[model samples]
Target: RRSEAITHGTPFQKAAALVDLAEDGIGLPVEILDQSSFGESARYYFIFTRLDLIWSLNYFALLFLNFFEQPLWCEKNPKPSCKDRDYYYLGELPYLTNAESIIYEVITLAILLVHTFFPISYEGSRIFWTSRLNLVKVACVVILFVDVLVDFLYPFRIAPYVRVIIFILSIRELRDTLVLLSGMLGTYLNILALWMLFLLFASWIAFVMFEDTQQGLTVFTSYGATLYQMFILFTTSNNPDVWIPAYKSSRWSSVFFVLYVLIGVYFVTNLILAVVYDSFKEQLAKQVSGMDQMKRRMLEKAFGLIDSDKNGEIDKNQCIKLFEQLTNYRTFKINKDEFADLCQAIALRFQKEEVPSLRSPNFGYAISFILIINFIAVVVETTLNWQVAEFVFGWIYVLEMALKIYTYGFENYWREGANRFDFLVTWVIVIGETAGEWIRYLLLARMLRLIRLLMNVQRYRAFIATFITLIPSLMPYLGTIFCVLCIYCSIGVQVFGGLVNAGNKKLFETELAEDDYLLFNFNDYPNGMVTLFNLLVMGNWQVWMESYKDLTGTWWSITYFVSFYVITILLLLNLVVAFVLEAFFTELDLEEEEK
Candidate 1:
């Protein structure tokens, strides 16, 4: 019962509860353990007992054998130099014997037979197999059956990823990690799916409009390619020639693309972003109750040590008496035990109260003043002869360090993290002055010394600490952001390949002139990615759009720029800001509540 209460107490308190439960198994409920009902405890025990790891290993082996070693097309059928060169098997190691390769296939076959039989014989889960949590596993099993037979005809490209996904889902810890992530971003993911649906419809519109164009809608040649083009246009790729030729055939091309941009990119994306940010705010508000509960649990643990009467709460008078008893060595002025107790009490209260011996407010103010002077000197040094101010500031900083060393001693002064910055800056300047021109560049690193300003204001300190706390939570978004950028860049390269020729006419026909009229120079992958990244930053994208408008002679180019601005600059950038502010406000609220 105690272990169960502890487990229910707070998130971090689960460790102690788990340890106790593991030892005694005393507090578990019957609903979780009923084998006849096929409850969670029974399901858990059965799930772990099954050969999931071994089965996953076999599926992985199957993937490597079928995907890497075998070729779907050969020289005789598709020819060696065909467009499907990307799909050709490239990992033919001459050193590996045929028998060794066959051994892997045999093992995979055995595992496949086991999987095929086990599902048929299996009874029930905690719930039905069609339940929400079990759906991914069921889908994987269905796909696996098809994939196995399909491999006999040709290598299945999507098979390996499906197997890996199922393997990840089978692991309890991995599944929990994904579940926690999904909870955090549920609203964001739904909005993304909604946008994807909009993009799909837009792609269909593009395919219909361009399927009969002169070039046969090369950008929308396939469904995947059409989706890529829609994403590119949504992100304001600034290359409009993909639709211009079709626009010449019919004005409906402009209408389709323009409406897609207006409805999907401009209005829907921003609306969804606002909704998602509001959801995050609501989630943060709810989390505060959990945070407060955790704090109270911590306080209970701390107060447990001082409740000498065995009462749940400490008596204020008794607590004060105990503190005084421990700190009374100055009056006694003898007894080694009393001296040790006094030292312990002093250490506990070291930074809890202001002390002149530890730190002086005057000295802090002086250091802050010197920092301000240094900042000004740096600004002046860029344009004027400010070496005299630098010299004075350097000496003042050195004198401050010397005074601190004298007051606190070497070990005490060096113990502080901020002291190291001062030490580094002082030494770098000394080295640069003594060691001549070659080492003077080291002094440039003193710019980092300005980080000290973050501590000068309480709000700045709070914001910095809050941002550091948000880093781990924000990391998952980075991988997704990178993937989105890569996909958009790939699409940009394909759609904008012909758009580079938009500015082919020279301004001066007699003289050599560069192609300055092109909106985006996405002639290659690197350029395309960099161009799209610049659009994300919203760097004079209007100039590029106007350049496209001039070259293409179509107002649909304006719609492209507007869509890209809303999607990338307005929506995505604001999403990042929302996450940051959410972290900041939550942390700020917790700090206030603690006070």
Candidate 2:
């Protein structure tokens, strides 16, 4: 309502006056825009941005607390207080000696108090929680109860029979038993192995982050620490400290570290390459099987929906629906004009359905293709150099970028459609993490296409064909062997290679090697041998050396990691390939093939 119009008159005159008043200020300057949808998008973006911000802040907060706690505590109390003096544990465990005993006791007390009020049960909420979380809670309760009984209940003396009972109960500790079982058994061990594999990849990333830098921990700080720690824990829990001798170096520690790397990182990490390869293969098989099931179900659904007469036969209309469901999909009602081609497409589908060309390629095939391409690229870069190729492939990269932008809009490509396959590649290609750190990292992405090619080879084709026959009959030991090998190799390279290049040299120096040292490089390193000798064994050693490892210490550590990546190409990477192949080949095996 406009207050005090210039003139008061009849209703029509008043309405006209209000319009005049509203338009009096240059017709409202510019038209006010409606942006309800834009507001929603802004809200959504803000929410995700806030979540990411919170997570980052939480991580930094945790670091700050941990980093400053010790210094701050020491500053406050240079001498040990009564509480600090009591930190020396009265317990006899060797591992807990260096740990703050009083803190440990307090933690135990807190756990006991919490559990007493809210005893955890297996039959709780989520089914998965029951299996994992509840088991842990129950185990904690039992362990704490037993400790209290043994320590405080009978501090001075204990009955032999009662002690034995308490000991048996304590042996039911969840984590310890789980570890023992994981090592002893195959399935549990594979799970443990996979977990370690995840950590290995993470450590690999961390190594790249810290390698050859004057500041922070060198290669010794990242992969080296991670690999050795996990290795000793896995292989021979007998001496859990075997993994970290360098960190706690004495004469004996030094001896252990040297021997551990030579045997562990050099030889074993190489063997594990084979295992990684097999694990990937298994993963591919599983993916293929799943895709096949999905395809069959889709076909069945199509058939069922189209056979509207219920006589187990699909007519033209039903066939058209199936085609629509598969291709040229649209949510809004399609006009009659689009349906004109639908009849033609349906006719084509029935006629062409039995032909070999109709089917999609399998996951295994795609994986094989990608791996081969990547492998070839890797060989070229590792042997020659990406810089040399960059000049030749500059246009190709530009063309690739142009095409990528054309297919997926540049905004989407930069925002969300970034490469997932080339996770490692992205790091290598990106020169700097931030504007301030834009100094040349001299990092090059690894070529992963060669492995894809190997998967596409005729031998791999035959393997795919035989997979159904092999999977049922193939012993579980194959998977077990693969898991163990991958684990061992990761340990060896992380430990030995890390130790050899501890001083953080960017390049390998073969001439500087002592007679006792093996002079580690991708060419001479055992893991590197798998790619050169085992896969493409025909290359001359001299040629391979020139093509592969120059005096870059990366030959020992980073290259070994690259070699083990074979598993990803062969197995885990081939999941989509196997699935597509399974669908195509399944029909090919039939008396009549689809188009």
Candidate 3:
């Protein structure tokens, strides 16, 4: 009966035809739902209510006050001066008035009670065990209960750590609000593990190298301290006390420090960026897959509309009706004009997918040209016609987005990740020009858009894929290399520290004349280590080593320099190159399969 209905007319006509058949006692393939009809809710009770939004607001408000507001105190307790009635029994801060303190205490207790009972309430019991946000609320309630109990018992020292835990949980709740865009977060979290491991070893090695010196005494004494100090090296060219001692200690020490800097600052940062790019690409692919599913659902609906007879297929009569309805010209047969109109409608309905095709060479070139023009304009800002030039370029970018939206419907156009970026940059340019003077400074945001062209290039994409892919695998080897360098740094400091700083008289007394003496400047730990690393890069290293030989009155200094030069400068660098090459080749293979 359904197929017969489909065989006669369009989706609505067919659906109506099916319902009529079902009314006549014919068996139908689908269930007919009458949306206009309603059922009485006499006995049922709504267990889970809409509490997520209201609860979040109330909880977050309390959290904000905890951080920003002064502590509340009671002026008139059972005693005359209620100085002892400070509600903030935790660590140091200001005090609030008596009425305000009492009100806040009452409010806090009210919130806590609501959370405790709400879980067993008809509204919350439905989701208490399964919902992540409910668990967070439970944690917050437990902590608040403890805080209140502790405050009542002891005003001198309530556990401040409980407050810290509560603050962290609040942030977690805030993040859960963006449940829709959690894929990117999931991707970054996976990458974060590798980053953590790399930093852990780096800090450990730094502590080992600096533990004995005055500079290390403070900076590398604890794991947290060493991690922070190591992180600082990634930003600055030099650090005081730390670098000077390491540089003076030995050439080997300098090599290790520089190696760590190169890996951490340059390579690791790029790897992280690549991981983000990969995540974005994955999101785009997922969107494309979703588009396919949407297209199928759309076709099914269209097919049902056309198949008016309760039949499996549309006959010639149904096609003719479909054409007549579309063109508004009654016809028993579709002519050339009617066929063209049908094709136009089909084109609108089945729009192009948002992914960039590798076959489009000109597409890549056009994007590159716009990117180069934007960059050049930013660079040559002092030129006479800079303003006019920028205005023209901005319009071109706007035009580019406008054309894309015109070609692809607004929904389809934004489905592409790159198009989303294009849309963002174009708006920033538009708003920056037309908006208030304060926001005109947002014109500088164009600088960020320049790098989008890199994604258009195959080579750039391949290299990024390779780098991101290699980071996790390279970590262990890199960690081992860093540990070895630290060991060398420690040895260099011990062997040369006293020898270098002992003075000219001691050198002469050791059977070497003062005139022909070579200086080894390992006076302190940080300077000595930094100086050793400098030698690895070949900057007047021979002169420094010759001084070491001359002062020490032995060929033993040559052996020491040669051993470091071979291991750090030669061997370790090759290991890095090998890893990079392996990653690049592997990525090339992967790209080929994708193509």
Off by over 4 Å in 3: 1-191, 222-224, 234-242, 248-252, 308-310, 323-345, 348-595
- For model 3, residues 117-187, the per-residue Cα lDDT tens digits are 55443333544466765676576667666766654563321323333334344443223212312465676
Top candidate (lDDT): 1
Rank by TM-score (best first) = 1, 3, 2
Lowest-sum lDDT 10-residue window in model 1: 506-515
Shift in Å, residue 539, candidate 3: 30
Write model 2 residue lDDT over 359-399, tens digit each, in one string.
Answer: 12474355445444544665575576654544333334344
Query: In terms of TM-score, how similar is model 2 to the real structure?
Result: 0.25
The estimated TM-scores of all candidates read: 0.43, 0.25, 0.34
lDDT of each: 0.52, 0.36, 0.51
Question: Which candidate leads the pack in TM-score?
Answer: 1
Of the two candidates 1 and 2, the one with more favorable lDDT, higher being better, is: 1
Error of 2 at 230 (Å): 22
Residue-level lDDT tens digits of model 1 in 1-595: 1333232333223323322232222323223322223232434434434567787676556544422332222223543332332222122222223455455545666676565334433334444454564566667666766665564444214554564565455444445434443554666667777877888887886777667675355556877666656766775554465567667777766777787778866798678868767865665566556544443333333233234354454345644543443333111222223323443345445413222244587877777666766666666666667456666766776787788888887756776665766677777676556522322233335445555568458768777767657756665444334334544544444443333332346222311113332334443344455666766766444455555555456666556555565455544566567788878888889778766
List the candidate 1 regions with Cα displacement exceeding 4 Å: 1-182, 214-218, 238-241, 247-253, 275-279, 282-291, 308-317, 322-392, 404-575, 583-595
